[PDB]
Amino acid sequence: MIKGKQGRFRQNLLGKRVDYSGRSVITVGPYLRLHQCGLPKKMALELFKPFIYGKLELRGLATTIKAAKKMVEREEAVVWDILDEVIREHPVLLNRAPTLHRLGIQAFEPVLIEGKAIQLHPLVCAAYNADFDGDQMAVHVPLTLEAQLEARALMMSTNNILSPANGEPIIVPSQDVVLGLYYMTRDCVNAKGEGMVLTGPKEAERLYRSGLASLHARVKVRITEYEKDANGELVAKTSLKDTTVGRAILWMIVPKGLPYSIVNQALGKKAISKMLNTCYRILGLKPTVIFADQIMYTGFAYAARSGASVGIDDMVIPEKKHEIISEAEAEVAEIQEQFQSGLVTAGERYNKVIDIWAAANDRVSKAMMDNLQTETVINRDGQEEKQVSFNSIYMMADSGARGSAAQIRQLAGMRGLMAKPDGSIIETPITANFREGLNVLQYFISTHGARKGLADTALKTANSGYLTRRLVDVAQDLVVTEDDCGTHEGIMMTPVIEGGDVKEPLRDRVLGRVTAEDVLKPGTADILVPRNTLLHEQWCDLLEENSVDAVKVRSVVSCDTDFGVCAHCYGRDLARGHIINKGEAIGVIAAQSIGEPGTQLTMRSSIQVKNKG
Amino acid sequence: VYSYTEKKRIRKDFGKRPQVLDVPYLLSIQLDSFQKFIEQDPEGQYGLEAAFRSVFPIQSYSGNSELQYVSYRLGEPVFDVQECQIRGVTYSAPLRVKLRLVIYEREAPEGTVKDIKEQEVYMGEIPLMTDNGTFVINGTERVIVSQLHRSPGVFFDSDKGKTHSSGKVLYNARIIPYRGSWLDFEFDPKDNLFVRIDRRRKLPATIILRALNYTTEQILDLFFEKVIFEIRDNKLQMELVPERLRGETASFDIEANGKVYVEKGRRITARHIRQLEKDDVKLIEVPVEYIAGKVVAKDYIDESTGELICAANMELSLDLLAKLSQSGHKRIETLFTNDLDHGPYISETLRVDPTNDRLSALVEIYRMMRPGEPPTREAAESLFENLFFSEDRYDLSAVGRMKFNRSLLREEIEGSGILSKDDIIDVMKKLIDIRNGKGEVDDIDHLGNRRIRSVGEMAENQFRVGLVRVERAVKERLSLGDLDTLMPQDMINAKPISAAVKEFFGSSQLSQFMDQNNPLSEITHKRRISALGPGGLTRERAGFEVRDVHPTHYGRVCPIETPEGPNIGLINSLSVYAQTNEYGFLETPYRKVTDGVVTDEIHYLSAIEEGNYVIAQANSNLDEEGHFVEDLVTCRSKGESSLFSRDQVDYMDVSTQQVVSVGASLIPFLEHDDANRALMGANMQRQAVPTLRADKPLVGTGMERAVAVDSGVTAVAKRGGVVQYVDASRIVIKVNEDEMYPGEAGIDIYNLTKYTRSNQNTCINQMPCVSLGEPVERGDVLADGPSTDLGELALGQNMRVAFMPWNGYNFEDSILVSERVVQEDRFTTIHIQELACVSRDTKLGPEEITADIPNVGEAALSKLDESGIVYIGAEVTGGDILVGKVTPKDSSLRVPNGVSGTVIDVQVFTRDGVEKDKRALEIEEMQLKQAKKDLSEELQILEAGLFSRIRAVLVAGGVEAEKLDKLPRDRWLELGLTDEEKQNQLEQLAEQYDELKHEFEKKLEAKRRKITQGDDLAPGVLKIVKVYLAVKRRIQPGDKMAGRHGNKGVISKINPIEDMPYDENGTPVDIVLNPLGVPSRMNIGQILETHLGMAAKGIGDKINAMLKQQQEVAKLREFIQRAYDLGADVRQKVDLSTFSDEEVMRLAENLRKGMPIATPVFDGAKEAEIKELLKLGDLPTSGQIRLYDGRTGEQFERPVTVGYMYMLKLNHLVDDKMHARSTGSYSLVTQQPLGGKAQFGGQRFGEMEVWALEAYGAAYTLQEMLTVKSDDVNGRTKMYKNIVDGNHQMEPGMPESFNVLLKEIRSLGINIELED
DNA sequence: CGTCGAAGAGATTCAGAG
DNA sequence: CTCTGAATCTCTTCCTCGTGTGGTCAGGACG
RNA sequence: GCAGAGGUUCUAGCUACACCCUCUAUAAAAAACUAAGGACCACACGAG
């Protein structure tokens, strides 16, 4: 009764169950801003009972606590009015069940709703990794004044935009808004309203709502592109830029500081995330929360008007597939006849069969992809012209909304070669897709992989949990207590290449840290950057011009402060783009950020030059 | 031809492959298995009799007293299923055993017994199995899942890899008995055989051989080929056989008769060995350097001093050889050691052997078996012969003998159950062969090595355990008591056998609670076979190759359905056609194939017999003449599909759905979606709560008319005839003349079970499906059960579904639902819930049940009668008072918060001795009157039927009908009926009727007594009252809703009807799904089911339009015939020209809602037929129509998909999820929340949430999560006053859990304190 | 009426040659 | 011959929240 | 409970952290003050 997961140390001392709690299922909750979340009335009444008693006593409605309890149980009209007072500016903590990393438990401002489900802003349904297939979040309440202020200055959903693991944003638009934006930012070579001149976005939105011009149409518009080139000043330039009606409508949503070279492209998913990141970088936080809240409204509203549905005719089966199948059968038959003649060995024939089947699978996949994306053909007011497809299955893959080319390979082309439970590749691959019928044997073979993948969940999670626990309890005590070690030595940093393209440039690893010795310009005896200056984006851009490969960087391994790392030795906080404050608990942050990707992580001649040089 | 109910709604069927074998009775695995456990077997094998035989010899040790079992029978059950469910007493039957006791004379084993004592004794209370295969234990329906455990016998593992960390393989053998101790032979890296019993410490293998009276010479001869040397004056000439020389390098040049064949230092070739054999030379010369390295075979002694020259199994010594040479033993023997082939793994083990005699080996065995126990010359002997060679302490089953003799390549099947001396050495030789290279290891996961154990075998084993305990008692009693002084009942006790059977049935890892969420959940739960339980593997001990699906699962078990989570792949469900062998293994039917023609007679093939054969595939086109139509047919020979010729095959699959389970076979277009999603599609059907108005599936597989009938929900008529009187609670059928017995046939009555609580708080209701005068055929459904329409499984309700994003209200898995769904009440399910108030007998006086509740108002007592019981029919809500119970100085039962239902019935149980109150008297009198009315109504209707039968004979024999009317109808005996063959039958009928009257006048009193008698109860309770609430849960944002194909998601908004999108004609859709879930998770079947549903509803709309206006019957008939033909060839081919043109107008009514469509799983409808069906009506071929936005009113570009999809409502409703609490009861460790459940609780601020708090800078909120909120006796009571005061302060205190840990360490002899 | 499998570190075992 | 490493035996731990059912000592007289 | 005693009520209500009132031998005129006994094990389920 001391040791183990049942003992005191891990059941009653660390994880104490708490009062003022709750639980419910999740709902889309789209309308509430990303700083607020829904809450059923029948739950917020029970959570905030002492506050209601106190407010009733202040009003004089209840002489004693007994009468207050009676009137609370009555659920009459006065009680709801009181509840709409203690709920005004009282954050609550929406905590997901398996909180792997720091963003698991966030704060929200309640908005009372009827029903019996907890709503949730869609843009934060990614950090939680919370689906909507009946997931269950628990609601906590901060009681003391300090707790209320903390759940406002640290935990509000508008305060942690960038994840602590990496600087990239964590509120990237996920499924429907991204598809809507992608369908908005496109072009059909001939749609009504082509070649016209538009006064501005205020007029483009009207010309589209009237139905006089289609959403996609190459036109000429004028745009007031605001520039921050003057330090602290907004320079307004207006040039007649050529773009689509859909892109022009999207211009009004974006703030003024950003340039126009972002909303002009096809706007997949990574483009949207980069747009948010640049907005945060060059505009701050306050004008980025509004932008990220407005982008979801536009994306939903123009994915609803799209009617992006999936039909059987979408998943085209390439015509070349039958011929490819026949020729692959002929090649495997030739190898079989050779083996029956004793020319080749069993293993050699097996390897040849595997290789030719892989080649045929790649060939049929290429044929299907080329018949899926390009094959759209329309008129340009004259002869026929080529244009990227509008197939819904293709639009859900190019935009990155949901699914990649690998899954579509399983929907139209052949499934490929499947693995036996012991790790071997079966000789005959499954030559049937999902749109077509799947045979009995080709399904009994397929069930092996599904069973193995589903059984690996119950071990991947069980091992990642233990690794995370060990990593948490090994650091567990690192806190940035001193502002400057004053040391000199720091570990070297160089780009890492395996022989292909550069895996990580020096502009990626070094950014966010502090140099050890004075980095020198390629022209010798020239100190480009001092020895103890932090490296932000305006410095990394300079480092690109001079093209320096080796830069010394101070790191927490060479710091000399006992019982805690330095502030300079740790570099950028990676959550807010400023030097880490004196005190932040960095011991647990790293353990959580390393043990978090442990769920999706898989548990298991002549060298030709790349380029001239 | 078609049955009458088949003609009511005949389902359009797809499919091209004509099935041959109808699906068997689904539950026939449990019913038959239990039928072999209580039914009499003169054979007495695997029967209650086969269990008695072994434990019934009864012999007092040298006491000349004998008792033998003779016969047994089961008494009539005291209570029926219905009458025992309410009382909670197990549905049991007394076990009466006849025992014969005889007394011999003193010291006369052969002498005749002086007297015979025979009587019938009552022992045990064995339960019984209901008609559906469910055991009743304590008023709760319980089902016992079959187990799948490693079969008794012998297995040779390999233990490849990690052992010894040097790339070596350690072969091992085990002898697993059915009841006994495991015996394991295991090799070692040093190549020494080691015997290990019961997983104890190791032991050299020869030790267990020495214990079997085996000499060293015998042991050596039993494992090796001896090479014979003969002393000669010719350089010690030796006999060399070429076969042994094969595989040996030429140590020295080999010559015979002065001619050299194989050169020295050259590897001997097979050609060289062949020419040696051709020369047929026997003796070959050998240097003395080759014999010295040869280990001797037999002990050689000198005849002068008598002592032994060289010991056997001793390496030859040249000086020892010289002593042997001078002694002159004409024959010299050595064993043929050959590291390549005949590895000497016995000689080295014998060197390791520490003993030399049998007694020493037995002493070592006793020392190892029982450590710390001093040896004894007799104790070891008894223990060794008891461990293995004892009939009682070791028993291999007949299946064990079969498997053990098959693995050893024997010929016989039946043999002794105890291990034999030769069997052990045969196992040893097989292991040595495995090591040498011959033979192969056996795969554990092979489904030919895991038998199935149903309920009957487990019950028999438990009965045997009870029997051996009672036998140990009775034998000891028989020795002490004087002979023939008492009846044989006194020596035996019923309870020891009972507390052994009832313990198994009640509490076990296999006697699981039965879930009744659906007619399919019951079916798939009585079929599930699990590998857990006693004698099986646990979750922690479960590896990863066991969970994987073996190649030998094809047709024997479902490769799709397995519960996710911890026990994944361990509880796989049985297939649809698989039927258990006689030994326990699994069998799957196949069709016998002659040289060219595939016959009709089918064969059941075992798990191992399937291997050596070649089996064709169900998707093999046939000419209907029996010959295959192509030249190359795919098959499955060695677990690897390939192509073969027509003449090679000799077996084909019986059907196309024989691989999948029952539930997984209900998914239409199953083959189109990935197995990962079908695994959840088959797991989200057994959780679909039954709705209010059950609706047939617009697109179903075709196995819906076989799950409703085969389960128990429906009420199939067992006799054919006509319906005489239907009603909402009873159906009376008048049987025909031929189908009825000549005497006492009468008529048949079915009683329908009205609203009764199920094990999952869902309603169980029966609704009539017929009308007066409608003929009813044999084996036909006429009582639709819960979630069942027209005898066709119907779990959900088909809904018009459109795939499109709608303003984010169906974001990533949400499901938008129109107001039209709630308005039609298409998903408002019933939820019957049961409450119970108990009146205990505490000190200071028992509690009162009265209605005089102190300190309560007049409002609460309005809903209470005089006796303190709520009126049957009131509408109670949360917090209302149900029954009044005042504790002896307010403990009255109250409705739990949130529940708002109507009381449907109240049943009051009273203990004998205490007085029944007024309400109890009212209930008892009501039940008595109802019982009398039932016994009178049955007689009135039966008399009507019987007298109707009597008139058939009364008109045969020249008897006028009017005179029979003149005399009283009840008694026609006044007239003299003409003598005939029917007069005697009628007189027998009348006499049986009179005897029946005398029987009823006693059964009435029996029922009177049964209702009136005070029922038994737990000790210390006076009366217990049960109150039933019937809530009607509606649909709500948050309630789960899942399709059949594996798509799930909660409802997000109940949109008003006008806001929904609508097609051109004006009909608004009812559900708006999110398409973005289809490409990521390949469940593409559902997109290909919506089109079929839309086609079906389009044909339904066309039929409805033809019906709404008056139309000639021929118009409807020709259109429906066209619809049923539908282009591509199908198996069904149903004709409408034979219908009488009046059943067509009824079929049209049953089809106007939309014609159902069948689709067998793996030969379903091709997309061409779907396109043709779509073109049969009007809807566009592609399957997408131009919707219109509801709010804006504009048009939707890129037209979207519309159609009808079957959508179940999962029972994970949101009303059972919200829990939030502020303050309440605390635990012993003062961790206040006490655990979120029915009792108040706070969600656990778990270990990871503390880290998530520490990652931020938040510490004050962490402190308030850890001290004030959770456990601080001076913190909670302080801040509860601070908050209501107005200031939100904090005081940490220090958690009580730490003051508990301090005590739990201080009480350990360790002083832990705090400084200051 | 109280009352009498796995898998890995580590600590035993244990060993081999110059 | 005495550590040298080299087998060999023994103790440890193997996610994290919920939703629910059912079953259960200790130790029966005893004066 | 100013100390002792009694107490409206809005379970019980000088301690649970408690608290207040009136009164002088014993209960009766009055408003403001609080939140309680719930262990272990098997089976099934859901999500990450």
Ligand SMILES: NCc1c[nH]c2nc(N)[nH]c(=O)c12
């Ligand atoms: N229970 C009697 C009574 C009435 N008012 C009271 N006020 C206080 N502070 N305490 C009490 O005990 C009472």
Ligand SMILES: [Mg+2]
């Ligand atoms: Mg989910």
